[PDB]
């Protein structure tokens, strides 16, 4: 039976969402606390937050494609 | 290299030292050779400066602001800096007993000034 083990591959693979969810808040906590020290507002800290969040979110997008491929192919 | 200059006399003045341990606001910090920049407030403790070997001079500072420059320079600006041998044990007990009885006995700034004088007298009497 291959259909029974295919459903378990989409549940245990979602355990990696803890690092992607906490990583978006870790980069936002340092940017909000650093901007109040004057005066990283326009660009500088604001431009690095958009590029820094894409690196932390890359692990969640790659792990989600593995569980989604087992439920379709 | 220390610059412990008071507002009445000069102690270190010229740069001819090695290590110095002064009580700051957080903990008992100690400057070594090329110290990092740290401008923390000094509390009422003992400011000992080790002169190469064991020729340290314990100077009981009354509190100030220990400034550490980036060029391995320590500027300990304090109001009063006296040695440990210049204090009397009989006269120190009279100031601590009068400040404890005057605390929480009136109003205005009389009770608030007695709490700060009792804490500074207890730290100097325990380091004899």
């Amino acid at each position: 039976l291959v259909l029974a083990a295919k459903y378990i591959g989409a549940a245990i693979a979602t355990i990696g969402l803890t690092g992607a969810g906490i990583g978006i808040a870790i980069v936002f906590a340092a940017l909000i606390n650093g901007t109040s020290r004057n005066p990283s507002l326009r660009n500088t800290l604001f431009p690095f937050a958009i590029l820094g969040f894409a690196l932390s979110e890359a692990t969640g997008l790659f792990c989600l494609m593995i569980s989604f491929l087992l439920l379709y192919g | 290299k220390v610059s412990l200059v008071a507002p009445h006399q000069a102690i270190f003045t010229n740069k001819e030292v090695s290590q110095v341990n002064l009580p700051a606001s957080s903990g008992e910090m100690g400057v070594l050779a090329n110290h990092v920049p740290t401008v923390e407030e000094l509390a009422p403790g003992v400011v000992e400066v080790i002169e190469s070997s064991g020729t340290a001079s314990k100077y009981f500072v009354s509190g100030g602001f220990a400034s550490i420059l980036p060029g391995s320079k320590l500027s300990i600006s304090t109001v009063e800096a006296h040695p440990l041998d210049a204090f009397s044990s009989e006269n120190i007990k009279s100031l601590l007993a009068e400040a404890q009885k005057n605390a929480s006995s009136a109003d205005e700034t009389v009770a608030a000034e007695a709490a700060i004088e009792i804490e500074v007298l207890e730290a100097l009497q325990a380091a004899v």
């Binding site: - | 507002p7 957080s26 923390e40 407030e41 602001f65 550490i68 980036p70």
Partner: protein, 54 residues
């Protein structure tokens, strides 16, 4: 030791001491009074030095 001249010395406030160029180079406690304590201590020191020279 015979003549003198009238000089002047500026004193910064608490808002100008924290807005310096290299003010963040030293480890200063931002939770306690660090910006206000630097301007209050400098006012009494500058007044004592000007009164002694005068």
């Amino acid at each position: 030791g015979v003549a003198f001249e009238p000089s002047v010395f500026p004193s910064f406030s608490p808002i100008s001491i924290e807005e310096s160029p290299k003010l963040s180079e030293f480890e200063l406690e931002e939770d306690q009074a660090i910006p206000t304590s630097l301007s209050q201590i400098s006012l009494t020191n500058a007044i004592l030095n000007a009164m002694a020279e005068g």
